């Protein structure tokens, strides 16, 4: 038993809800929140800028120190940093950016990072401003993640479409 509420159960291990991930994180304070990161950990907008804003820019300060030491992430890769006021940990995961010509096949590699964590609150990777179709992202999630994932879907009309079309 965990503290996530109001999710629809899609499979043994995948749950979904129409929610802003920032609001879900503040209320639940999960062990792991997933950020939809880019390779530079430049959290300007989307999931990243909203989470970062909720941390009063502490996420960005920590991230800039990480990059100065380690260099950029790989597309499909991840790093674990602090969850600040939102979670114990933040798993920064880089999904492909379709608008930059990045291989959509790397979306599966991105979701594989979730399997290193028993329970996660996550958004639909590569959705929103990253230019991928949320319907495909959900399918890859279900077919790749084996740990327990609670998906916060920002858009209600897309949420209802994701549910109605789910196989
Ligand atoms: N605060 C937030 N900002 C951005 N996104 C990404 C996102 C934007 C637009 C649509 C969709 C989707 F999944 F419905 F297609 C996802 C968030 N997802 C959860 N919370 C979010």
UniProtKB/Swiss-Prot annotation:
Q: How is its activity regulated?
A: Inhibited in vitro by GRL-0617.
The reported result of mutating residue 164 to L is: In strain: Gamma/P.1
State the source organism's domain of life.
Viruses
Q: Where is the Macro domain?
A: 1-167
Q: Where in the cell is it found?
A: Host endoplasmic reticulum membrane
Q: Which reaction does it catalyse?
A: Thiol-dependent hydrolysis of ester, thioester, amide, peptide and isopeptide bonds formed by the C-terminal Gly of ubiquitin (a 76-residue protein attached to proteins as an intracellular targeting signal)
Give membrane topology per the record: Multi-pass membrane protein
Note the subunit structure.
May form homohexamers. Interacts with N protein.
The protein's job, in short, is:
Responsible for the cleavages located at the N-terminus of the replicase polyprotein. Participates together with nsp4 in the assembly of virally-induced cytoplasmic double-membrane vesicles necessary for viral replication. Antagonizes innate immune induction of type I interferon by blocking the phosphorylation, dimerization and subsequent nuclear translocation of host IRF3. Also prevents host NF-kappa-B signaling. In addition, PL-PRO possesses a deubiquitinating/deISGylating activity and processes both 'Lys-48'- and 'Lys-63'-linked polyubiquitin chains from cellular substrates.
Q: What is this protein called?
A: Papain-like protease nsp3
Organism name: Severe acute respiratory syndrome coronavirus 2
Task: Give the residues of the full protein shown.
Answer: 1025 to 1191 of 7096
């Amino acid at each position: 038993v965990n503290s996530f509420s109001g999710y629809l159960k899609l499979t043994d291990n995948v749950y979904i809800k129409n929610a802003d991930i920032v609001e879900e994180a503040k209320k639940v304070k999960p062990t792991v929140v997933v950020n939809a990161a880019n390779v530079y950990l430049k959290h300007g907008g989307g999931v990243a800028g909203a989470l970062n804003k909720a941390t009063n820019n502490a996420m960005q300060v920590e991230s800039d120190d990480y990059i100065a030491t380690n260099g950029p992430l790989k597309v499909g890769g991840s790093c674990v940093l602090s969850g600040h006021n939102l979670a114990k940990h933040c798993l920064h995961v880089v999904g492909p950016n379709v608008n930059k010509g990045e291989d959509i096949q790397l979306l599966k590699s991105a979701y594989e990072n979730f399997n290193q964590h028993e329970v996660l609150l996550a958004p639909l990777l590569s959705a929103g401003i990253f230019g991928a179709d949320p319907i495909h992202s959900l399918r890859v999630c279900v077919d790749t993640v084996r740990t327990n994932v609670y998906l916060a879907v920002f858009d209600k009309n897309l949420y209802d479409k994701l549910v109605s079309s789910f196989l």
